[PDB]
Design a binder for this molecule. Structure first.
Ligand SMILES: Nc1nc2c(ncn2[C@@H]2O[C@H](COP(=O)(O)OP(=O)(O)NP(=O)(O)O)[C@@H](O)[C@H]2O)c(=O)[nH]1
Ligand SMILES: [Mg+2]
Length: 162
C-alpha cells in the first residue's frame, strides 16, 4: 500500500489501559482476549488510511506504561474508564508530553474499555470535561468491541493532514 503523506503517532498512558490492544484492533481488526503481556520497550507498526482522498501512513508506536516524544507528530493518550487512577494520572502524562514532545504535536484523549467486561468508574462527562480543559479532542473506545478505534486514528490522521 502506497501513500501521500506519513506521520509518527505514539500511544502513551498507564500500564494496563489498553495501548497494545488498541493498536492490535486498529491494525488487525481483532481483539485477542489473550495473555496480558506488558510492553517493555517501544516498537512500531504501519497502517495506511484514506483521509479526504489522501492516503496517510501512520507509523504507530506502542510504549511501556510501567527522546521518543521529540520525534512524534501526534500522541494518543489513553486511560481506562474502569481504573480511576489511570484517569487521575492523565495530567501527569500531559505535563510530560508538553515538556518533552515537539510543541506542535497533535493530541487526543481516549477513555478506553467502554464495554461489558468491567464496571465504569469514570463517567464520559468527566473525560469530556478534562479534554475541554486542555483543548484536546476526546473519544471513548474499546479494543474489545472496536468502539471508535478506526474513528480515533482517522481523526488524528485528519488533524495531522490538515
Ligand atoms: N474489556 C477490555 N479489555 C481490554 C481492552 N483493552 C485492553 N484490554 C485488556 O486489558 C489488559 C491490558 O491491555 P494492554 O493492551 O496490554 O494494555 P497496555 O496499555 O498495552 N499495557 P502496558 O503499558 O503495560 O503495555 C489486557 O488484559 C487486555 O486484554 C478493552 O478495550 N476492553
Ligand atoms: Mg502494552
Amino acid at each position: 500500500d502506497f501513500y501521500d503523506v506519513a506521520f509518527k503517532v505514539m500511544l502513551v498512558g498507564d500500564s494496563g489501559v489498553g495501548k497494545t490492544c488498541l493498536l492490535v484492533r486498529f491494525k488487525d481488526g481483532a481483539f485477542l482476549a489473550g495473555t496480558f503481556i506488558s510492553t517493555v520497550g517501544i516498537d512500531f507498526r504501519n497502517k495506511v488510511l484514506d483521509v479526504d482522498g489522501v492516503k496517510v501512513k501512520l507509523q504507530m508506536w506502542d510504549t511501556a506504561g510501567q527522546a521518543y516524544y521529540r520525534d512524534a507528530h501526534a500522541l494518543l493518550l489513553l486511560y481506562d474508564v474502569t481504573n480511576k487512577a489511570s484517569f487521575d494520572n492523565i495530567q501527569a502524562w500531559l505535563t510530560e508530553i508538553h515538556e518533552y514532545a515537539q510543541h506542535d504535536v497533535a493530541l487526543m484523549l481516549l477513555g478506553n474499555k467502554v464495554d461489558s467486561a468491567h464496571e465504569r468508574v469514570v463517567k464520559r462527562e468527566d473525560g469530556e470535561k478534562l479534554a475541554k480543559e486542555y483543548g484536546l479532542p476526546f473519544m471513548e473506545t474499546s479494543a474489545k468491541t472496536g468502539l471508535n478505534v478506526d474513528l480515533a486514528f482517522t481523526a488524528i490522521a485528519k488533524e495531522l493532514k490538515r
